[PDB]
């Protein structure tokens, strides 16, 4: 009824899932003005999501992505040129517009053997805040940051969703591959790998064999290494629609 019409609306606020939305509509919270007069009922992530409600429903043109990409790769390099940062999503594939910016970050000092270096991520988050790029934090942990960013103006741009995730160096490219391609491409590359006797996931590529269910991750130093193993000619991100 109107109770389902309100829940649908509430699910449009980042951070407010179905469960939270229902109890909220139960509390008598139905419209955006209701939410704005009841921040005390929402968690941080939800409140920030509400603050940028409109901006968050606005698409991000490629021109802007390219500019935000320059700010991120640039600040990252200054901190330590040994950091590798890659903006993924449909954007990497050449999309004319995006809904957000998803970044995978790594550093050779951090391998899957390592695991426990929050500061490699935080140092980046902190620097991006110092330059007034990252403006708010939805939530931040030891390997993942979900937040808000905004392009600078001499007057202004809509606030945008940005996420940055710290990935082990030895699992990096398998990571970038997963976060690019496309649901359909990943599905197609994954199946071709199987025919070749390999199994690919977002962390590694392994050899399979008889009886099935086997492994031991091979070294990956580029996306190319993954394509080589399954003897597929390298496919540029723009040819990864499927």
Swiss-Prot record:
Q: In UniProt terms, what is the effect of altering residue 100 to E/S? A: Loss of activity
Q: Supply the gene name.
A: Polb
Protein name as annotated: DNA polymerase beta
Can you cite an annotated GO cellular component? spindle microtubule
The EC number(s) this enzyme carries: 2.7.7.7, 4.2.99.-, 4.2.99.18
Biological processes per GO annotation: apoptotic process; base-excision repair; base-excision repair, gap-filling; DNA damage response; DNA replication; double-strand break repair via nonhomologous end joining; homeostasis of number of cells; immunoglobulin heavy chain V-D-J recombination
Its assembly, as annotated, is: Monomer. Binds single-stranded DNA (ssDNA). Interacts with APEX1, LIG1, LIG3, FEN1, PCNA and XRCC1. Interacts with HUWE1/ARF-BP1, STUB1/CHIP and USP47. Interacts with FAM168A.
Shown residues in whole-protein numbering = 91 to 335 of 335
Which residues are K(+) 2-binding?
11, 13, 16
Q: Which UniProt keywords apply?
A: Acetylation, Cytoplasm, DNA damage, DNA repair, DNA replication, DNA synthesis, DNA-binding, DNA-directed DNA polymerase, Isopeptide bond, Lyase, Magnesium, Metal-binding, Methylation, Nucleotidyltransferase, Nucleus, Potassium, Sodium, Transferase, Ubl conjugation
Reactions the enzyme catalyzes? DNA(n) + a 2'-deoxyribonucleoside 5'-triphosphate = DNA(n+1) + diphosphate; a 5'-end 2'-deoxyribose-2'-deoxyribonucleotide-DNA = (2E,4S)-4-hydroxypenten-2-al-5-phosphate + a 5'-end 5'-phospho-2'-deoxyribonucleoside-DNA + H(+); 2'-deoxyribonucleotide-(2'-deoxyribose 5'-phosphate)-2'-deoxyribonucleotide-DNA = a 3'-end 2'-deoxyribonucleotide-(2,3-dehydro-2,3-deoxyribose 5'-phosphate)-DNA + a 5'-end 5'-phospho-2'-deoxyribonucleoside-DNA + H(+)
Q: Which cofactor does it need?
A: Mg(2+)
Report the locations given in the UniProt record: Nucleus; Cytoplasm
Q: Where does Na(+) 2 bind?
A: 11, 13, 16
For binding Mg(2+) 2, which residues are annotated in this chain's numbering?
100, 102, 163
Q: Which family does it belong to?
A: Belongs to the DNA polymerase type-X family.
Q: Where is this region: DNA-binding?
A: 93-102
The positions annotated for binding Mg(2+) 1 are 100, 102
- The stretch of residues making up the signal peptide is none
- Residue numbers binding a 2'-deoxyribonucleoside 5'-triphosphate: 59, 90, 93, 99-100
């Amino acid at each position: 009824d109107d109770t389902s019409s309100s829940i649908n609306f509430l699910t449009r606020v980042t951070g407010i899932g179905p469960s939270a939305a229902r109890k909220l509509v139960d509390e008598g919270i139905k419209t955006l003005e209701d939410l704005r007069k009841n921040e005390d009922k929402l968690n941080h992530h939800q409140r920030i999501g509400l603050k940028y409600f409109e901006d968050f429903e606005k698409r991000i043109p490629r021109e802007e992505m390219l500019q935000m990409q320059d700010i991120v790769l640039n600040e990252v390099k200054k901190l330590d040129p040994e950091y590798i940062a890659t903006v993924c999503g449909s954007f990497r594939r050449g999309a004319e517009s995006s809904g957000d910016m998803d970044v995978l970050l790594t550093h050779p000092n951090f391998t899957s053997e390592s695991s426990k270096q929050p500061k490699l991520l935080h140092r980046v988050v902190e620097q991006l805040q110092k330059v007034r790029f990252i403006t708010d934090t939805l939530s931040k942990g030891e390997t993942k940051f979900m937040g808000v960013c905004q392009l600078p103006s001499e007057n202004e741009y809509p606030h945008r969703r940005i996420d940055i995730r710290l990935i082990p160096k030895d699992q990096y490219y398998c990571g970038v591959l997963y976060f690019t391609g496309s649901d359909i491409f990943n599905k197609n590359l994954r199946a071709h790998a199987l025919e070749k006797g390999f199994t690919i996931n977002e962390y590694t590529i392994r050899p399979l064999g008889v009886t099935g269910v086997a492994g031991e991750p091979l070294p990956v130093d580029s996306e190319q290494d993954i394509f080589d193993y399954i003897q597929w000619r390298y496919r540029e991100p723009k040819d990864r629609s499927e």
